[PDB]
Design a protein around this ligand. Structure first.
Ligand SMILES: Cc1cc2nc3c(=O)[nH]c(=O)nc-3n(C[C@H](O)[C@H](O)[C@H](O)COP(=O)(O)OP(=O)(O)OC[C@H]3O[C@@H](n4cnc5c(N)ncnc54)[C@H](O)[C@@H]3O)c2cc1C
Ligand SMILES: Cc1cc2nc3c(=O)[nH]c(=O)nc-3n(C[C@H](O)[C@H](O)[C@H](O)COP(=O)(O)OP(=O)(O)OC[C@H]3O[C@@H](n4cnc5c(N)ncnc54)[C@H](O)[C@@H]3O)c2cc1C
Ligand SMILES: C[C@@H](CC(=O)N[C@H](C)c1ccc2[nH]c(=O)[nH]c2c1)c1ccccc1F
Ligand SMILES: C[C@@H](CC(=O)N[C@H](C)c1ccc2[nH]c(=O)[nH]c2c1)c1ccccc1F
Lengths: 560, 539
């Protein structure tokens, strides 16, 4: 559960996830995941190749560092490395461009040195040395950023420290009276839940990156998790934090559950994306481990009816732990991942239709997956409430097995990038939040802008462009898109990708969607920020950065 | 529901509330509230006199200095204004005890020079521009209900002070029934907002005790909390969007997405800013269908600790009703005295929602409560407790007629500090009063008004007969400061909801850290480099 210092021992140096986990063709020519890490690991996916084929049309730099600083660093006993593999591993997150530069290229700039502090006091020492020797610090936790938040600016001439938090990973206390846990910021989501569970508790904060993403990362990026309906997003979960900045340590003097003591400075730090200082410790709300979990799924005649149903569920404030509504292409894709071998003489579509002979169109139908957790009595009553609401919108119970499957798929989908890259398929997921009344139109127009933009950029085939609704709020929804294409005969595939991704974002903003729901701004969405938060708002951000970090030690250049 | 420009037409110039609403002795010698405005109005309270006697042992203007080029430009805007003394004085204070004395039997060091009534966002922009041009100071005012000296004009402010009154900027702009949000002007009062929305079948459910007069703008500025936050949220959960006029320009996000990751949330730079950065002119707030049904309740416990433990369990099972308040023995006796064993405690309950869910919920709560020795004590108690909510503020003016002074104060604290904090704060008030010559042991009582996952809001009342003290305000001021020191020393916060204003400024830096304080200052100096927004709250 602890990230080791030499990460490549465990994790892939050139893509997502663990070294022991990749898609390969088995001895029957069926896609399958190696290893035994996930419940889908070692399970043949006999229809998956076909769905890939049908969908995409393919056949299956020296360490520049001051010796005085070095010398002082040795006295601290803080572990460090100037090794290229350590530096490179920490020079990127998980944006598509980054993964290409790992594979077929090299980064313009990487950290000069990697430090592993093990506690708050180590971080204070490091920041003090950075003030003294004019060093730039870029913090890293899990390295899961999808916003270019870890990329080293190419023209940064100072020595860049990668301040790796992975060895600051302790739970410091569990306060069972107040249901809070105070933890060091480098603890990963899986390690955090694992240790709390041994005492009968959890946070319930479950981003899809939880295997590697950290408490400090979550706070920095305003992370959102699958079960936020019950447990809250990161801003609802964090009760307290400690932050080391060049100006000194930020920390409130008490742990009162709610205050009126001026503008909440916790929100000056949350979303700061490594531009102000290092979050070293935080107190986070915990809950007793749920007695009981129940999966579920519901089919709707179309997406629009599914959206209307999600809205009503939000309106009655009876959303389960997790509810996600997927469009018909994702419904199909999920169909394509089950274990029963088709006949080769019956098509994909004709195979689906006979299988679900619902009075529904199988090219229109959408599916919501559901997760309920809590006390078994409560969960079961609540499941019946949601299913009764769904019945009113044409909804039909589609079984716990799809829900259970959908929920497992989430930790596996990231492993599909690298598979795609082996076979000329590139893509990325992206997200927005939008008012309830813009959701349908926004999804339709964005998927369409992407088709028009690919066609016009010489993309041979119509791209995969697909969506689901992943979160519901009172005032709207999170919409999560996937965009993918075969880059067969494009001169500059990345450019085409990059430009199409920007055009989708322009379309999103024009349809009432936000700049980001959860991934953040990093360096990827900087150019829209000022418009999103207004000029004065941007200058307020700037004024906090100039005060706390006047010499721009925290020089990742995100946000501003 | 609109506050008139001449507030004294309807509201007491020297105290809380409406002119038609005061406690008096009726024709049977029983206390009673005059007028028809509350459900308790014109209802005799046979044993309230008796309770008071037992408890406290009693029986029963500077000129307006204004630049004429400024006034000349101001006339051209057609924005209504006044330099009249009664308008300026009315807006020179809130509802702290010391201010109510300077209002009654003295005079304020400093009052606004001129009162402006903008009716919209654009008016406000014009005003702020004129303040930049003529070097004027602006103190915003909504309901004037601050209990933190947040409206007090600094004595040495030599610039012309504008009281920028938001009461005529009070309209609902639109109600989006698809997204359940209402976009409103910031001067609307809570009662007028709920009244209008209720005609369309909606509510916000944000019900601070001051809702008759407090405004949307005020709530955002002070981080207000309401009685039913368990269902609807506090102000930070309710506000989806806002528009703010600062000297640097207008702050406003470009979209109404329900939740974002776009850097530090700048809504939180303005929420809690207490009039020091600019004017909140408009806000979008979440609404809900009006609940079908309300039910009251009450539970008796053998003592306060047991009640507290039960509240904690209720919070732990995340099954709090709309409101749950636990009062100590003294407040139980008080409440008993206001119908039409020395340690026994009582919780009042308010459930609201759909009838069948409410009844189900109510059973669940009584069940939990039985495990801490909790016994159902009737719906009528609960009802009465909640109907007293809006009349307690009228009791100050009663007490002042009979040499009784006091104030309420509040904190939030972790669950494991609540009982010790209550006991220690209450004893520190006794100790301090005796040492300063207060003849009779003060009233010193508490209740838990809100529960959260990580703790509770604790609400105190302190009051005494000041018979034979020579500086009774100084005794009060010092005792309240002492109580605050005791709260902080027992793990309580500087404020749960009242805010800091000028009253708690001295503790702020310690509460939020030096660098934290420095972050607030840097925002102020950016948005407002010449301190046009110069009430001097917080910093
Ligand atoms: C497969 C996959 C699934 C994902 N699922 C989700 C999801 O469900 N929800 C979601 O919100 N996000 C998701 N993400 C995005 C990402 O995991 C989150 O934004 C996460 O919060 C980053 O955490 P981390 O520890 O990896 O931070 P990193 O990626 O290490 O760094 C993030 C930013 O924070 C800074 N930083 C990191 N730690 C600290 C610290 N202690 N102090 C100060 N600054 C710091 C870095 O400098 C950088 O700017 C996903 C990403 C991937 C690749
Ligand atoms: C009897 C009584 C009961 C109360 N009950 C509660 C309660 O339950 N919960 C609670 O939280 N508080 C309560 N309070 C305190 C008070 O009502 C709240 O702080 C309320 O939010 C203040 O609103 P207001 O419009 O009265 O603002 P005012 O008191 O007019 O102003 C408060 C501060 O905000 C500034 N301001 C006002 N409007 C604006 C604007 N539009 N833009 C920028 N700044 C502005 C003022 O300069 C001042 O600094 C109570 C007060 C009293 C007297
Ligand atoms: C799954 C996706 C690639 C991708 O978007 N990966 C990133 C790292 C990712 C994967 C899952 C995420 N969940 C979330 O909230 N943010 C997420 C970001 C993909 C793979 C293969 C082909 C196309 C494609 F879009
Ligand atoms: C009721 C109280 C006076 C008082 O504190 N009134 C203020 C204005 C008040 C009244 C009600 C409040 N509710 C809340 O959250 N904060 C509140 C503040 C009182 C009256 C008479 C004698 C003593 C005394 F403490």
């Amino acid at each position: 559960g602890i990230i080791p210092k030499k990460r490549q021992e465990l994790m892939k140096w050139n893509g997502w996830g663990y070294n022991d986990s990749k898609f390969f063709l088995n001895k029957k020519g069926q896609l399958e995941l190696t290893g035994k890490r996930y419940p889908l690991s070692g399970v043949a996916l006999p229809t998956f190749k076909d769905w890939i084929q049908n969908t995409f049309g393919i056949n299956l730099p020296p360490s520049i560092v001051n010796e005085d600083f070095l010398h002082e660093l040795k006295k601290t006993n803080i572990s460090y490395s100037q090794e290229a593999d350590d530096r490179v591993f920490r020079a990127h997150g998980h944006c598509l461009h980054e993964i290409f530069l790992l594979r077929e290229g090299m980064f313009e700039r990487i950290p000069d040195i990697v430090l592993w502090p093990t506690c708050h006091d180590d971080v204070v020492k490091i920041v003090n040395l950075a003030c003294k020797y004019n060093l730039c610090i870029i913090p890293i936790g899990g390295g899961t950023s999808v916003s270019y938040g870890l990329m080293c600016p190419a023209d940064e001439t100072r020595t860049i420290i990668s301040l790796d938090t992975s060895q600051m990973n302790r739970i410091l206390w569990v306060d069972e009276n107040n249901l809070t846990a105070h933890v060091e910021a480098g603890i990963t989501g899986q390690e955090l839940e694992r240790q709390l569970k041994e005492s009968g508790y959890c946070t319930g904060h479950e981003p899809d990156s939880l295997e590697f993403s950290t408490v400090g990362g979550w706070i920095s990026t305003r992370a959102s998790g699958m079960k936020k309906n019950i447990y809250g997003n990161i801003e609802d979960l964090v009760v307290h934090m400690k932050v080391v900045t060049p100006r000194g340590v930020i920390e409130k003097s008490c742990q009162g559950p709610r205050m009126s003591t001026g503008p909440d400075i916790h929100h000056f730090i949350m979303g700061s994306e490594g531009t102000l200082g290092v979050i070293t410790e935080a107190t986070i709300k915990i809950r007793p481990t749920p007695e009981y979990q129940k999966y579920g799924s519901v089919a709707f005649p179309n997406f629009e009816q599914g959206v209307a149903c999600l809205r009503e569920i939000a309106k009655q404030r009876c959303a389960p732990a997790s509810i996600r509504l997927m469009d018909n292409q994702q419904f199909q894709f999920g169909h394509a991942l089950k274990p029963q071998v088709s006949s080769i003489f019956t098509s994909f579509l004709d195979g689906l239709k006979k299988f679900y002979i619902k009075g529904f169109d199988p090219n229109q139908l959408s599916v919501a997956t559901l997760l309920f957790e809590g006390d078994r009595e409560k969960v079961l009553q609540h499941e019946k409430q949601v299913y009764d609401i769904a019945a009113k919108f044409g909804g039909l119970a589609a079984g716990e097995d799809n829900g259970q499957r959908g929920y497992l798929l989430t930790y596996v989908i990231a492993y599909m990038r690298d598979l795609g890259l082996e076979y000329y398929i590139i893509g990325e997921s992206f997200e927005t939040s939008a008012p309830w009344d813009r959701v349908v139109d926004l999804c339709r127009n964005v998927k369409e802008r992407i088709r028009r933009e690919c066609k016009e950029k010489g993309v041979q085939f119509p791209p995969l462009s697909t969506c689901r609704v992943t979160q519901t709020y009172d005032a709207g929804a999170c919409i999560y898109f996937y965009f993918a294409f075969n880059y067969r005969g494009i001169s500059d595939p990345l450019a085409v990708f990059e430009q199409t991704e920007a055009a989708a974002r322009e379309e999103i903003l024009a349809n009432g969607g936000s700049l980001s729901h959860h991934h953040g701004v990093g360096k990827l969405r900087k150019q829209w920020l000022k418009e999103s938060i207004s000029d004065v708002g941007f200058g307020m951000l700037k004024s906090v950065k100039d005060y706390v970090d006047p010499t721009n030690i925290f020089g990742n250049r995100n946000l501003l």
